[PDB]
Amino acid sequence: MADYLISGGTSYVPDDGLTAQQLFNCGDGLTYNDFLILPGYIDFTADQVDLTSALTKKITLKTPLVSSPMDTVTEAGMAIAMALTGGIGFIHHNCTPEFQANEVRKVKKYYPLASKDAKKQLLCGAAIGTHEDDKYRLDLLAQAGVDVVVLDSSQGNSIFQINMIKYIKDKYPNLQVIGGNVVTAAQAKNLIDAGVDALRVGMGSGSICITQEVLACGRPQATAVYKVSEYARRFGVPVIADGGIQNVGHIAKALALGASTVMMGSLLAATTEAPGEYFFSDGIRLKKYRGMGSLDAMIKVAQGVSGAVQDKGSIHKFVPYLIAGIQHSCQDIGAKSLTQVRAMMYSGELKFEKRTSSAQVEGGVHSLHSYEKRLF
């Protein structure tokens, strides 16, 4: 009897570690490789973990991986491919509107967990601009049959973006929009009261964004995804993480801080289904990678740069490594779903820990003469 009715079910479970709530009000600007996740008790293995997540308030996915809408990372090829592996892709807005019209008609008509609708057609998203000339851009791909759109912007709460939500939802109520870019709760309020359906958190944290050093704005991104998902839980709105993703660990860190889908732009760059084409340098196979703020887009200013990244193969051999990396991580946390790991984080059942620079210099590799970092 009394082994049960002193507490009831729960054992002692000592108090070593920091929950996220007292981790992130310390005032430190945390990024991904500055905290990490402490392990706990497991009762399962790596393959029955239900890795489903939500992109908007209605449509949910079999994996939390989404491509970022730039022309140097995704078009209809990787939209097709990431749909067929479970994820979702967007399409950039620096082309003509008929170009993405044809791009969406290519991806829409056209693998067990392939993320298909009630029409059993593959999910497709896109992204539009913010200026009022894009109203003629928007209704064309609305005629093409897009599912979600992303208001790609450097800062979220303009009058322009709020008027675009109040322009879209009273015209196209079944069509669902993504707000962005939101990085605090203060601008997270003005989009949820606008009525937006999900948020896209993170500015200044990309591989190629220098706008933290040019415009002196933004935030560290792992203290941003936490507080935006903290405010956005109050209304049941999922958030989408941008920037600072370099590997598959940061995926799990963004997923355990409240973000439901992780948006990658560099880690999905230099793939077979990425647009453009290859060129060698020092004998290394690579392809170019640039951002919308870079002046290789078109009295200007530049928030992005233009560089290149070495090849990473086809995505159909790449995203199984990423979902297995999320699955082994969610096993070592101790939750057999992403819903359950966000439950354990909001309740405090898993606990984090800070790092120092001396702590991450041991976290990678050290005391070697040379090494061959082979990932899969």
Ligand X SMILES: O=c1[nH]cnc2c1ncn2[C@@H]1O[C@H](COP(=O)(O)O)[C@@H](O)[C@H]1O
Ligand Y SMILES: NC(=O)c1ccc[n+]([C@@H]2O[C@H](COP(=O)([O-])OP(=O)(O)OC[C@H]3O[C@@H](n4cnc5c(N)ncnc54)[C@H](O)[C@@H]3O)[C@@H](O)[C@H]2O)c1
Residues contributing to the site for ligand X (CB under 6 A)? 68, 70, 206-209, 211, 242-245, 263-266, 291-294, 303-304
**b/e code 97-135 from CB counts within 10 Å (16+ = b):** beebbebbebbbeeeeeebeeeeeebbbbbbbbeeeeee
Binding ligand Y (rule: CB under 6 A), the pick from 154, 157, 266, 329 is: 154
- Number of residues that make up the chain: 376
**50: CB partners within 8 A, 6+ apart:** 336, 337, 338, 339
User: Minimum distance between the CB of residue 201 and ligand Y, rounded to whole angstroms?
Assistant: 9
User: Which of the residues 26, 209, 217, 330 is marked catalytic?
Assistant: 209
Give the C-alpha separation, 40 to 19, whole Å.
Answer: 13
- The angle at the Cα of 73, spanning 81 to 77, to the nearest 5 degrees, equals 30
Q: Does 121 bind ligand Y (CB under 6 A)?
A: no
Say if residue 311 is exposed, middle or buried (CB neighbours under 10 Å; 0-12, 13-18, 19+).
middle
Q: Does 323 bind ligand Y (CB under 6 A)?
A: no
Residue 242, marked binder: yes
- Map residues 350-369 to x or -, x wherever contact with ligand Y holds by CB under 6 A: --------------------
- Please report how the helices 319-333 and 76-85 are oriented relative to each other, as an axis angle in degrees rounded to 10: 40
Residue 291, marked binder: yes
- Map residues 215-254 to x or -, x wherever contact with its own copies holds by CB under 8 A: xxxxxxx-x---x---x-xx-xxx----xx-xxxxx-xx-
State which H helix or E strand residue 288 sits in. Answer: strand 284-290
Q: How many residues bind ligand Y (CB under 6 A)?
A: 22
264 binds, among ligand X, its own copies, ligand Y, none (CB under 5 to 8 A by kind): ligand X
Is residue 352 helix, strand or coil? strand
User: Minimum distance between the CB of residue 92 and ligand X, rounded to whole angstroms?
Assistant: 10
Binding ligand Y (rule: CB under 6 A), the pick from 45, 247, 310, 314 is: 45
Looking at residues 141 to 160 of the shown chain, list those that interact with its own copies (rule: CB under 8 A): 154-155, 157-159
Residue 209 annotated among the catalytic residues of the structure: yes
Looking at residues 237 to 276 of the shown chain, list those that interact with ligand Y (rule: CB under 6 A): 242-243
Residue 206, marked binder: yes
Amino acid at 298: M
Q: Which residues are catalytic?
A: 209
Residues of the binding site for IMP: 207, 242-244, 265-266, 289-293, 303
